[PDB]
Ligand binder design. Structure first.
Ligand SMILES: *[C@@H]1O[C@H](CO)[C@@H](O[C@@H]2O[C@H](CO)[C@@H](O[C@H]3O[C@H](CO)[C@@H](O)[C@H](O)[C@@H]3O)[C@H](O)[C@H]2NC(C)=O)[C@H](O)[C@H]1NC(C)=O
Ligand SMILES: [Cu+2]
Length: 223
């Protein structure tokens, strides 16, 4: 249970719910076929925001994850419960207007992931123990313009069967400046990219103990 509730750009937090479409409730999405897998949604309620955050291509934004919207601390229990082991992921989607576009459909490409490392430490643990900081590099070679940023943590502690995986995601509204447009990504759809039978979605992380993990979705886009 966790919420991506603010974005940091160049050392500066842009504000709670400012340019990030936040739900009030920190519960997961569980159905990978639901339109809610894109930018959260029903049975949650998601707030709108008219703020679009300007970001320089080639630099990093930081998604800031908190247990609740009211949370003010940054210790592990203020981010997410440490049972919630799994990957962190981030995607971009070019849109005409980042304040009104839904996220649902084709256009997403993956720009960041952190699965399980050699020491069996998971991406989510690095965020939990890293003050909730999920750092994501905006590619330098993409076309400038309006984008949605989808930042995600997947908790796999109850994912032996499907449904079981817990998907925590929110979408931020960006204006990417300075991109060269040198490369055009191949894209996937949400819903569509993840299936219930994917080996990184339906997985027992205890029996046997995992030493390699396949993060779901397409491969990472690089310049
Ligand atoms: C900007 O965002 C980048 C992600 O999109 C991020 O890159 C990642 O940084 C981490 C650590 O800084 C790297 O992780 C590993 O490095 C060594 C082996 O490579 C390990 O010993 C560490 O434990 C750690 O897991 C990621 O590999 C790296 N990913 C990529 C694609 O470069 C940058 O750190 C972010 N930059 C800033 C300034 O925040
Ligand atoms: Cu939870």
């Amino acid at each position: 249970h966790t919420i991506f509730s603010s974005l940091e750009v160049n050392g500066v937090n842009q504000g709670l719910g400012e340019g990030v479409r936040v739900p009030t409730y920190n519960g997961p999405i569980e159905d990978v076929t639901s339109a809610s897998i894109a930018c959260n949604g029903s049975p949650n309620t998601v707030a709108s925001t008219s703020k679009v955050i300007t970001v320089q291509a080639g630099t990093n934004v930081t998604a800031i994850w908190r247990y609740m919207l009211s949370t003010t601390g940054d210790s592990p229990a203020d981010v997410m419960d440490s049972s919630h082991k799994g990957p962190t992921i981030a995607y971009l989607k070019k849109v005409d207007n980042a304040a009104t576009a839904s996220g649902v459909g084709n256009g997403w490409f993956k720009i960041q992931q952190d699965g399980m490392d050699s020491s069996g430490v998971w991406g989510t643990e690095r965020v939990i123990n890293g003050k909730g900081r999920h750092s994501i590099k905006i590619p330098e070679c993409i076309a400038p313009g309006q984008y949605l940023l989808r930042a995600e943590m997947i908790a796999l502690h109850a994912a032996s069967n499907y449904p079981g995986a817990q998907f925590y995601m929110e979408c931020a509204q960006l204006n990417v400046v300075g991109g060269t447009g040198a490369k055009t990504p191949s894209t996937v759809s949400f819903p569509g990219a993840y299936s219930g039978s994917d080996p990184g979605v339906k997985i027992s992380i205890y029996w046997p103990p995992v030493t390699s993990y396949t993060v779901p979705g397409p491969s990472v886009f690089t310049c």
